Design a protein around this ligand. Structure first.
Ligand SMILES: [Mg+2]
Ligand SMILES: [Mg+2]
Ligand SMILES: [Mg+2]
Ligand SMILES: [Mg+2]
Ligand SMILES: [Mg+2]
Ligand SMILES: [Mg+2]
Ligand SMILES: [Mg+2]
Ligand SMILES: [Mg+2]
Ligand SMILES: [Mg+2]
Ligand SMILES: [Mg+2]
Ligand SMILES: [Mg+2]
Ligand SMILES: [Mg+2]
Ligand SMILES: [Mg+2]
Lengths: 195, 76, 183, 90, 169, 183
RNA sequence: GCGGGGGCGGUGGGGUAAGCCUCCGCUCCGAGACGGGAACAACCGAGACCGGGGUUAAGGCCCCCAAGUGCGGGCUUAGUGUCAAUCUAAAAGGGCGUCCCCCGCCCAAGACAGCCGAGGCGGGGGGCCCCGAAGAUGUACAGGGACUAAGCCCGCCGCCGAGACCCCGGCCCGCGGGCCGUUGGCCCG
RNA sequence: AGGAUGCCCCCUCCCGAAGGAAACCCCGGUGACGGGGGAGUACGAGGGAGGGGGUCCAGGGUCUGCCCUUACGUCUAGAAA
C-alpha cells in the first residue's frame, strides 16, 4: 500500500543520552551513551527521518510505500536494543555438547580456542572482537557479553558455526536405523541481560 | 481540495469505487484515468465513469484521502 | 581561489578552456553534455577534474560485474597488441572512453574533439595553485540523491578491478595531502 | 530536498508567470498545491500548481489552509513583504 | 505418437466424415459420464464447476483420456462416487493425419517425402473454441476444495491453457 | 458590468480564452461557469451542483451571458452523431435552456458564437430578427427554418442578442463595436 | 513474353514445419529514384526533367544525429528493458516480489497474535517484474555510447524531418490552332 | 583559344513568389505551450539601380575538411556477391 505519513516513537530510558547527527543527505549517525558504555550506529541512505523530542526518538516517513514504511518498526527495534545495551547489557549463552571426545574451550587474551573437537588435531581459533567478553563456566557453558547486541550475537553465532562441519566433513545427523548421530558442537541456547 | 468518490467499471469486467483527492472533478478524473491506465493497462475508452460525488472527510473510507486533506506541507 | 559556477549551456565561450568538476555527476549524462560541447565549439578545450567522483547508478555488484566482464572476456585471438581491444580501468581513462563512444567515429572531427578533452582524477596541483580557478557544474547531469537508491563511484569501480593501482594513487594523495592542503 | 508548506512564498519557474512570486495557500496532494499571487499584487492567478514548477524562497507568512486573497494580502503586510512580491527574478 | 504440439493448432478443415476416411481410428475413451449419472440423484448436487478452455486448439484423444482418468480417480477417492457427477463434455470427432513412410498402408505411402503427402490416419482430437466447457462437474458445496483439486489435475494433462469456473446450478 | 461565461466545451481550442479576452477588453468582469466534468479550465460557478433556488440570485448578479459552445452545441443542434464521444452534450440541457431563456427575458446581453445562434434560434428567441451563424449549410438552414434572417457579417447584434460566426476569426474591433452598439 | 517474385488476406488445400508445395485477390519489385527501418528488391512514407526557396510524410528529438536531458500521473530494481515487421525469441507451470481491483466471513472494540485494544482471516482477478531460461572467435548484443530513465503503462505539448506538396526560373513533351513555296521551319494555346 | 564592360567585398536604394518570426502588452493552461495585438511587418528565391574599395575571374593539377556513395559485363524472381 501507500502511506501519506507515519510516525513512531522510542522512549529514551533514564540515564541514557542520545545524539543524532546527519552525516549526509539521507545518512544518520546515532550515538547512545549509558552507564555501561557508548554505542555508535549508522543508518545510511535511509528514508526514515530521525529526530529527538524531549526524551524520545521520533521516527517518521513521508510519502512512503511498504518498503519505506517497514523501516519504522526496524529502526525502533534496533534503537530499543541500543538502549537496553547500555543499561542492562547483553549476555548470550552457549552450551558445549560432545559425544565421545571432550572439547577443551579456553580464552587466551583475545583468542577463543576450541581443542579436541571430534578428536581433531586441528585447533579452532576465533578472534574476540573489541567490546565482547567471553568466559568459560565449567566445561559445558560459554557466555558472551557486551553492549552491542548485534556484535555479541554475531560472535556467538560464529562460535556455533565454527563447530558445524561442511562439505565432505559433515557427519550424518542420525545414527544407524535412525537414532541420534554424531552431534557434537557448541549451540547458542539463549540470551539475557547482564543486569 | 475535496475527496471525490468515483464509481466506475471497465470493458474488461472490472468494477471499482475509489476515493481521489482533487481540486475539481476534472483533476480527480485525470488521476483516475492515469492511475488505472498505469496499474491495469486500461485505455481511457475502456474505462466508464458512472458516478462522481464529493464525500466529506469524516465519512470517507480511505485513510490516504483523509491524511491528504490535513496536509500542511509536502517534500520533493 | 576556487569559484563554483553553473555552466550556461547557451553561453559556452568559443575559445579558451572550461574546467568541469565531475563530483556528483552521472557518468553517461555528463559525457553526453561534454561530447556535445566539444563538437559544437571546435576551438574550445574542456578539462574534467575529479573524474573518480563520477557516479554510475545501479547496484554495486551489478556495475562491478559489468566492468569485470569487459576487462576480462573481451579479447582477440589475433595479435593482441596489433588487432585487439585495450580496455581502460582508471576513472580518467574510463570516462574519456565513454566520451569517445559519443563522438563521430573514424573521422577527423571525432578525433580532433577527443584530443581537446583532458580528464583528471581529483584536482591537479597546477590547477589548484591558480589565482582563480573556475569550476563548472552541469545540474541536468547531476545525480538527484534519493533514499534507497543504489549507485557507485568510478573510484569504487577502480578499486574493485585494480586494487594495487588504486592503493598507490590513494597513498600518493596522502603523501601530497599537506602540500595540496597548503595550496 | 525541496519543502513546500502553507504560507511559503515561492517563485514560479515554468509557464507564462515565470519569474513571479506567489504564496502557497493550500495543499492538494503530494504533487500539487494552490498558489495565489495575490494577482492584483504580483500577477499570479489563484490556481493549482505542480511542485516541480515552483521553488521556495526563504520567506514565509502565517495563514490558514485555503486562505482567501485578502487574508493573504493582509498577512503580506504584517510581514512587510509587499515590495518583495512585485520583484521578478531573472 | 508425435509430441502434441504437432497437432495443437487448427490448421485446416474438420476431418470427420468417417464414410470417406479409410481406417479412421476407433475412439479409445470407454466412458464420458462418471460418478452418479441418474437425474434423480443429481438433484442433491447444488454446485457446478467447469474446466473451461482459454484458447482455441485441438486436444488429442489420449490427453482427454489422461485428464479423465486423473480427475475421476481423485474424485472417486476423496469425494465418493455417490456424491459427484463428472462429464467429459467434448468428443474427439476430428481425425488426425500423418505423412510417414510405412508398409501395409497403401502403395502411395511408399513414396518418400512430400510426394503424395496426404497423410494416413494417426489419431483423433477434439476441436475446441475459447470459453468451451471441457469438463463439467456437479457436486455438493462441502467438497469444493476437492473438486477444484481434481480439475487442477485434469488441466495439467491438457495441451491448452484452461480456467476453473465455479457457479451454482 | 459582470458577465457570466458558460464553458460548455473546450474542443474548439481557443474559443474560451478568446471570448474571455474580448469581454475583458469590453469592460466586463468575467465569471466562469462549468457544467460538466470534462472541462479543464478553472471556474468559480459550478452549474452542475448549484441548487435551483440559487438561480434567481444568478440572473440578478450578471449583466451578460456568454456561451463557449464548441462542437457539443454544434452536434446537438443538428441532432447528429459526433465523430468523438467527448463531443456529446454531457450537460444538463434543461438547465441550459432555462438559463438562456431567463437571461433573454430580462433583456440581458446574450453572446452566441459559432453554432450557439442556431441553438438560440431553435428556442424561438430570434424569430424575425437578424442573426449570423457559423456559415455551414445545415446551420444556415436551421436559422431559416426558425424564421431568422441570416446575415453574412462576422458579428451581428439583434437588440440584446449578439451572434458571431466564429470567435476565433473575429477581430477585437468588430466584437467591441457590437458590444458598444445600442439594443 | 509464354521461368516470375515480396507483403497482406481466403483456419485458403496439403504438410510436424519450412525463406515448403499448389490455387484465389489487392498492391509493390522485376522495369522505380528518394526519406525511415543499423545495414536490406518488393515493411512504412512516397512516386524523381534541371536549379533554387518553402512546408510536410513515415519516423524521430541525451550524444553519435537535424530536432525536447519536453509536460502531468503511475509502475519496475530485474540494466528487466531501451518507440512495428524482415531481425536474433520464448511456453506450460511457480511467486501477496511488488502495485492495484472485487467478493465472502469475523470484530459493534469481549476480533487476529501471544490480560491487552483495532482492525483481522480467506477467495477471485489485473499490471510490472523474478524463477522456469543452456552453445560454441569478442564485452549487461540487436545499431553503439550508455541510461534507474534515456525503461514500461495512461495521456499531452512543441519541434525536426524526403526528390512528396507549394512557389520561382530554365528545359522538354502530347494534343490542338496559326504563319511560311514546305522531303522542312517557326509561333501561340 | 574564354571574361577582364569581369569577379569579390562593403554600403545604399527599389521590387519581391511560396512562406514568415521576435521583444513586448492582453486571455487560457500544472505544464510543455495555444490564442488576440505587434504583423502578412522584420525578413524571404530571385529580379533591378547606384557608390566606395580591391585584383585577376573562369578553367585546370593535387591535397585536406564536411556531406553522399555496395567494380564492370552477364543469365536470373533476385548481383557488391
Ligand atoms: Mg601499441
Ligand atoms: Mg491449413
Ligand atoms: Mg510456367
Ligand atoms: Mg503472390
Ligand atoms: Mg527478367
Ligand atoms: Mg535505410
Ligand atoms: Mg543536435
Ligand atoms: Mg509455443
Ligand atoms: Mg537484456
Ligand atoms: Mg579574350
Ligand atoms: Mg545465374
Ligand atoms: Mg537461381
Ligand atoms: Mg552485376
Amino acid at each position: 500500500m501507500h502511506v501519506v505519513y507515519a510516525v513512531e516513537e522510542v522512549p529514551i530510558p533514564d540515564g541514557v543520552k542520545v545524539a543524532i547527527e546527519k552525516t549526509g543527505p539521507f545518512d544518520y549517525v546515532v550515538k547512545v551513551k549509558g552507564p555501561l558504555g557508548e554505542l555508535v550506529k549508522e543508518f545510511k541512505n535511509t528514508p526514515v527521518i530521525m529526530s529527538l523530542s524531549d526524551g524520545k526518538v521520533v521516527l517518521e516517513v513521508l510519502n512512503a510505500k511498504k518498503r519505506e514504511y517497514a523501516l519504522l518498526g526496524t529502526y525502533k527495534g534496533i534503537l530499543k536494543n541500543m538502549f537496553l545495551g547500555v543499561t542492562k547489557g547483553w549476555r548470550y549463552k552457549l552450551k558445549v555438547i560432545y559425544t565421545h571426545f571432550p572439547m577443551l574451550v579456553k580464552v587466551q587474551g583475545n583468542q577463543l580456542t576450541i581443542e579436541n573437537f571430534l578428536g581433531r588435531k586441528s585447533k579452532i581459533v576465533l578472534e574476540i572482537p573489541k567490546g565482547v567478553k567471553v568466559e568459560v563456566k565449567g566445561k559445558e557453558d560459554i557466555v558472551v557479553e557486551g553492549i552491542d547486541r548485534e556484535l555479541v550475537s554475531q560472535f556467538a553465532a560464529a562460535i556455533q558455526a565454527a563447530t558445524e562441519l561442511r562439505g565432505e566433513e559433515k557427519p550424518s545427523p542420525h545414527g544407524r536405523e535412525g537414532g541420534l548421530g554424531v552431534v557434537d558442537g557448541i549451540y547458542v541456547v539463549g540470551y539475557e541481560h547482564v543486569k | 481540495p475535496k475527496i471525490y468518490r468515483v464509481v466506475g467499471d471497465t470493458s474488461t469486467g472490472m468494477k471499482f469505487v475509489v476515493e481521489v483527492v482533487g481540486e475539481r472533478p476534472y483533476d480527480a478524473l485525470e488521476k483516475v484515468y492515469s492511475v488505472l491506465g498505469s496499474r491495469h493497462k486500461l485505455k481511457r475508452t475502456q474505462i466508464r465513469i458512472r458516478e462522481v460525488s464529493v464525500v466529506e472527510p469524516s465519512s470517507a473510507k480511505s485513510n490516504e484521502a483523509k491524511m491528504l486533506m490535513v496536509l500542511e506541507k509536502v517534500v520533493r | 581561489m576556487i569559484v563554483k559556477k553553473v555552466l550556461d549551456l547557451s553561453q559556452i565561450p568559443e575559445k579558451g578552456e572550461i574546467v568541469i568538476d565531475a563530483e556528483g555527476h552521472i557518468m553517461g549524462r555528463l559525457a553526453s553534455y561534454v561530447a556535445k560541447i566539444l563538437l559544437s565549439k571546435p576551438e574550445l578545450r574542456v578539462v574534467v577534474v575529479n573524474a573518480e567522483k563520477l557516479v554510475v547508478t545501479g547496484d554495486r555488484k551489478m556495475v562491478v560485474e559489468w566492468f569485470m566482464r569487459k576487462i576480462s572476456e573481451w579479447r582477440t585471438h589475433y595479435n593482441p597488441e596489433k588487432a585487439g581491444p585495450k580496455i581502460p580501468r582508471r576513472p580518467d581513462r574510463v570516462f574519456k572512453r565513454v566520451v569517445r563512444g559519443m563522438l563521430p567515429k573514424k573521422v577527423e572531427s571525432g578525433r580532433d574533439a577527443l584530443k581537446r578533452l583532458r580528464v583528471y582524477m581529483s584536482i591537479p596541483l597546477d590547477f589548484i595553485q591558480r589565482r582563480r580557478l573556475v569550476l563548472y557544474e552541469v545540474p541536468a547531469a547531476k545525480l538527484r540523491v534519493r533514499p534507497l537508491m543504489q549507485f557507485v563511484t568510478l573510484e569504487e569501480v577502480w578499486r574493485s578491478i585494480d586494487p594495487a593501482a588504486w592503493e598507490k594513487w590513494n597513498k600518493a594523495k596522502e603523501v601530497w595531502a599537506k602540500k595540496i592542503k597548503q595550496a | 530536498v525541496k519543502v513546500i508548506d502553507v504560507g511559503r512564498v515561492v517563485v514560479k519557474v515554468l509557464g507564462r508567470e515565470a519569474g513571479r512570486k506567489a504564496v502557497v495557500v493550500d495543499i492538494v496532494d503530494e504533487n500539487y498545491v494552490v498558489i495565489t499571487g495575490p494577482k492584483s499584487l504580483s500577477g499570479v492567478r489563484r490556481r493549482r500548481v505542480n511542485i516541480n514548477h515552483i521553488e521556495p524562497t526563504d520567506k514565509k507568512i502565517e495563514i490558514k489552509k485555503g486562505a482567501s486573497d485578502e487574508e493573504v494580502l493582509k498577512a503580506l503586510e504584517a510581514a512587510g513583504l509587499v515590495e518583495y512580491m512585485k520583484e521578478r527574478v531573472k | 505418437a508425435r509430441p502434441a504440439r504437432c497437432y495443437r493448432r487448427i490448421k485446416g478443415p474438420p476431418y470427420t466424415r468417417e464414410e470417406y476416411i479409410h481406417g479412421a481410428p476407433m475412439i479409445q475413451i470407454p466412458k464420458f459420464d462418471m460418478g452418479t449419472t441418474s437425474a434423480a440423484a443429481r438433484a442433491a448436487f447444488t454446485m457446478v464447476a467447469k474446466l473451461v478452455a482459454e484458447e482455441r486448439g485441438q486436444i488429442r484423444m489420449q490427453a482427454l483420456e489422461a485428464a479423465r482418468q486423473i480427475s475421476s480417480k481423485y474424485l472417486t477417492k476423496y469425494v465418493g462416487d455417490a456424491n459427484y457427477y463428472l462429464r467429459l463434455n467434448v468428443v474427439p470427432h476430428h481425425v488426425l493425419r500423418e505423412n510417414r513412410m510405412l508398409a501395409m498402408a497403401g502403395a502411395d505411402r511408399l513414396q518418400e517425402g512430400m510426394r503424395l503427402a496426404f497423410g494416413s490416419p494417426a489419431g483423433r482430437a477434439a476441436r475446441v473454441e475459447p470459453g468451451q466447457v471441457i469438463f463439467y462437474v456437479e457436486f455438493k458445496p462441502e467438497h469444493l476444495a476437492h473438486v477444484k483439486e481434481a480439475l487442477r489435475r485434469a488441466a495439467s494433462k491438457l495441451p491448452i491453457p484452461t480456467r476453473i469456473v465455479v457457479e451454482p446450478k | 458590468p459582470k458577465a457570466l461565461l458558460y464553458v460548455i466545451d473546450t474542443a474548439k481550442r481557443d474559443e474560451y480564452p478568446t471570448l474571455k479576452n474580448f469581454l475583458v477588453k469590453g469592460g466586463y468582469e468575467v465569471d466562469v461557469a462549468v457544467g460538466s466534468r470534462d472541462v479543464n479550465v478553472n471556474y468559480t460557478v459550478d452549474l452542475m451542483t448549484l441548487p435551483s433556488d440559487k438561480l434567481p440570485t444568478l440572473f440578478e448578479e450578471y449583466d451578460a451571458f456568454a456561451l463557449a459552445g464548441g462542437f457539443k452545441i454544434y452536434y446537438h443542434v443538428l441532432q447528429k452523431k459526433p465523430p468523438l464521444k467527448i463531443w456529446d452534450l454531457n450537460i444538463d440541457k434543461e438547465r441550459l435552456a432555462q438559463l438562456v431563456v431567463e437571461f433573454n427575458r430580462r433583456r440581458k446581453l446574450l453572446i452566441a458564437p459559432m453554432a450557439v445562434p442556431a441553438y438560440v434560434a431553435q428556442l424561438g428567441l430570434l424569430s424575425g430578427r437578424h442573426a449570423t451563424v457559423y456559415p455551414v449549410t445545415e446551420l444556415i438552414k436551421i436559422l431559416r427554418d426558425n424564421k431568422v434572417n441570416f446575415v453574412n457579417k462576422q458579428v451581428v447584434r439583434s437588440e440584446n442578442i449578439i451572434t458571431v460566426k466564429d470567435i476565433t476569426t473575429t477581430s477585437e474591433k468588430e466584437f467591441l463595436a457590437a458590444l458598444r452598439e445600442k439594443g
